[PDB]
Amino acid sequence: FRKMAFPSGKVEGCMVQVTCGTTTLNGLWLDDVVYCPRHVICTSEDMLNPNYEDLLIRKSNHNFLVQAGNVQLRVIGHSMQNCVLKLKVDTANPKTPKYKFVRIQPGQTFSVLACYNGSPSGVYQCAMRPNFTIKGSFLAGSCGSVGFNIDYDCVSFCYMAHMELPTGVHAGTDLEGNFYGPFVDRQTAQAAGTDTTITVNVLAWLYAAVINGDRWFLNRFTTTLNDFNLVAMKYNYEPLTQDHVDILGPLSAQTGIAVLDMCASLKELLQNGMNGRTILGSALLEDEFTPFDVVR
Amino acid sequence: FRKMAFPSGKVEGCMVQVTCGTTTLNGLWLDDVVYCPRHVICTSEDMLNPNYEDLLIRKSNHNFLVQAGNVQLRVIGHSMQNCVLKLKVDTANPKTPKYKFVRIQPGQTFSVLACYNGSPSGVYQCAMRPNFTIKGSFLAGSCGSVGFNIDYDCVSFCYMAHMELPTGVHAGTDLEGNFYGPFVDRQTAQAAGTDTTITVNVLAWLYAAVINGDRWFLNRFTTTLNDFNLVAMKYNYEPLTQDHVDILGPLSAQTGIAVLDMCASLKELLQNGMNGRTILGSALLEDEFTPFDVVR
Numbered sequence: 177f178r179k180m181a182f183p184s185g186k187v188e189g190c191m192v193q194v195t196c197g198t199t200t201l202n203g204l205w206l207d208d209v210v211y212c213p214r215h216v217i218c219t220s221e222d223m224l225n226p227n228y229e230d231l232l233i234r235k236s237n238h239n240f241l242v243q244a245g246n247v248q249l250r251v252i253g254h255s256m257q258n259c260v261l262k263l264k265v266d267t268a269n270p271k272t273p274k275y276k277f278v279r280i281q282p283g284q285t286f287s288v289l290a291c292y293n294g295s296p297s298g299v300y301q302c303a304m305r306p307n308f309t310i311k312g313s314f315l316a317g318s319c320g321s322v323g324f325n326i327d328y329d330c331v332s333f334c335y336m337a338h339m340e341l342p343t344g345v346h347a348g349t350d351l352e353g354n355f356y357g358p359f360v361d362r363q364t365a366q367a368a369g370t371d372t373t374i375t376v377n378v379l380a381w382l383y384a385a386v387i388n389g390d391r392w393f394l395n396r397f398t399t400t401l402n403d404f405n406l407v408a409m410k411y412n413y414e415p416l417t418q419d420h421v422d423i424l425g426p427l428s429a430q431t432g433i434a435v436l437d438m439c440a441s442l443k444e445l446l447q448n449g450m451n452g453r454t455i456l457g458s459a460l461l462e463d464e465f466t467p468f469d470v471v472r
Numbered sequence: 473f474r475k476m477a478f479p480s481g482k483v484e485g486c487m488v489q490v491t492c493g494t495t496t497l498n499g500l501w502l503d504d505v506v507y508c509p510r511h512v513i514c515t516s517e518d519m520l521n522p523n524y525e526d527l528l529i530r531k532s533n534h535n536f537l538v539q540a541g542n543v544q545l546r547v548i549g550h551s552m553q554n555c556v557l558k559l560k561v562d563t564a565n566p567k568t569p570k571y572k573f574v575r576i577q578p579g580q581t582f583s584v585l586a587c588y589n590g591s592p593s594g595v596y597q598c599a600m601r602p603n604f605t606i607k608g609s610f611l612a613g614s615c616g617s618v619g620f621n622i623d624y625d626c627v628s629f630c631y632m633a634h635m636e637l638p639t640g641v642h643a644g645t646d647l648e649g650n651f652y653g654p655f656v657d658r659q660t661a662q663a664a665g666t667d668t669t670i671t672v673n674v675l676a677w678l679y680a681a682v683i684n685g686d687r688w689f690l691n692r693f694t695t696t697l698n699d700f701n702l703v704a705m706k707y708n709y710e711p712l713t714q715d716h717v718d719i720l721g722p723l724s725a726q727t728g729i730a731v732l733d734m735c736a737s738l739k740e741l742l743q744n745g746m747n748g749r750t751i752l753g754s755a756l757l758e759d760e761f762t763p764f765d766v767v768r
């Protein structure tokens with residue numbers, strides 16, 4: 177049971193390089209618009225107290241160099257939506273897939289296509305952590321790399337990287353420029369809050385273990401939502417909600433293990449450990465598969 | 473320091489669906505040849521003792537249905553090279569990338585594009601295990617999916633999946649149809665040998681941890697090569713060879729830590745565990761980064 181990223185080809189055809197002054201980063205080219213973090217227009221002096229609308233006012237199209245591989249794309253307009261810069265360009269991207277912009281919630285998963293200076297380097301699967309950060313690519317120049325899900329050849333773009341936080345994780349926005357988490361695109365002291373394990377995803381992963389014949393951790397016991405959350409808080413797991421219980425419904429129907437039965441298994445695992453056993457392949461409980469990921 | 477798969481777009485444009493009778497799986501369309509596992513010509517009565525020369529001589533070109541998306545490719549020739557079938561087709565793939573065929577060795581890494589009925593479903597990075605199998609979440613219908621590296625826009629194809637072993641891992645061939653390991657394309661009792669940890673890769677990754685500022689696991693000890701292997705084999709670690717020591721040389725010189733000194737650290741990590749700590753972000757000794765990967 178490997179974590180898999182989505183095939184990245186549809187996104188690879190959209191990655192471009194965007195340069196403003198001395199700063200170069202990645203941009204996303206869909207139709208005749210290139211999207212990228214607005215902080216590309218900032219010099220170091222601006223980064224401490226940026227006035228973004230005024231800085232964009234002082235910029236012209238000729239300040240923006242956009243290159244899609246060998247071809248330079250002529251910028252013919254520029255505007256801002258929240259924290260995302262929108263560069264209108266000469267030419268519509270002939271490789272634009274069917275796509276949508278969506279905003280995801282903490283705990284949901286997606287693939288990141290790590291890019292350096294407009295060229296894709298690698299792809300990985302991750303989850304939006306409860307503290308609204310993403311485990312880092314650890315690749316310089318990754319600003320502007322995007323996160324996405326693919327559903328029947330429609331690409332749902334959900335993330336763009338704006339920053340690396342001191343712990344290596346990155347922070348960023350949706351494609352409408354709205355930050356995930358309490359972070360700002362200014363040079364200031366910012367840090368990831370204390371993170372928690374995504375409980376509903378661990379439960380999904382235990383159901384995957386059961387579907388794949390790994391059942392030693394099942395027991396006769398059951399728990400209540402409130403009793404579980406008391407243990408959850410103790411081991412810094414996200415509280416489980418009734419909505420979480422409901423989305424696990426199809427897995428509970430498929431396996432015969434009610435969610436509160438599996439919560440009893442998880443509670444025992446947290447309080448007593450694994451006794452040298454493994455689940456699927458791991459001595460560690462995995463939390464970067466959603467219920468949806470497990471069904472599919 | 474995330475494990476990443478290569479961007480898969482160059483391989484996605486080569487994946488097709490190959491059908492022979494009732495049997496459907498994945499093929500690789502490069503230039504005017506489609507490569508796929510030869511057991512596509514097996515019926516249900518053929519799995520236990522297939523006679524491939526006899527099964528193939530009875531086929532004509534029109535017995536092979538090849539579908540590239542919504543387009544049928546016309547097969548105009550067919551032949552067998554070891555365990556891989558080669559279908560010559562009407563049309564050279566216009567999306568053929570620069571490519572080579574390479575045979576890899578246990579411990580080397582590559583990306584797998586997992587596919588179902590010719591359509592890419594996900595991508596992941598892995599290592600060829602010492603027992604010549606791949607730990608892969610491989611759906612029904614993933615036969616014919618391929619493994620690859622990408623270097624300077626050249627795709628090196630090293631692997632094609634042929635079957636699942638009873639323990640959930642898969643086995644396959646190079647693109648000349650020669651199996652990795654002692655496996656055969658026959659439904660027999662064949663099982664993966666005991667898997668071992670890839671020692672040289674763990675050591676390379678500990679060097680990467682030192683380079684990125686982790687040092688907590690270092691100690692004041694050294695070891696002889698023979699004493700290390702005597703201990704490491706008690707944890708199901710692969711033995712370290714003088715070739716492996718030579719390969720680690722550049723990282724030794726970069727860090728100022730002798731190879732046998734790092735080996736002493738590994739010995740202590742196996743004895744002590746991590747004690748709640750992390751190395752490059754993980755709670756596990758990672759063995760799927762090669763020295764080449766790390767030096768890069």
Ligand SMILES: *C(=O)[C@H](C[C@@H]1CCNC1=O)NC(=O)[C@H](CC1CCCCC1)NC(=O)c1cc2ccccc2[nH]1
Pocket residue numbers: 200201215223315316317318319320338339340341342360361362363364
């Ligand atoms: C964007 O591509 C680069 C990516 C890496 C990280 C730093 N240098 C690189 O090549 N990231 C940046 O350019 C941002 C710019 C931000 C400035 C502050 C807030 C808005 C955008 N810088 C960082 O991501 C950054 C700087 C920094 C300094 C000290 C600790 C952490 C840290 N992260």
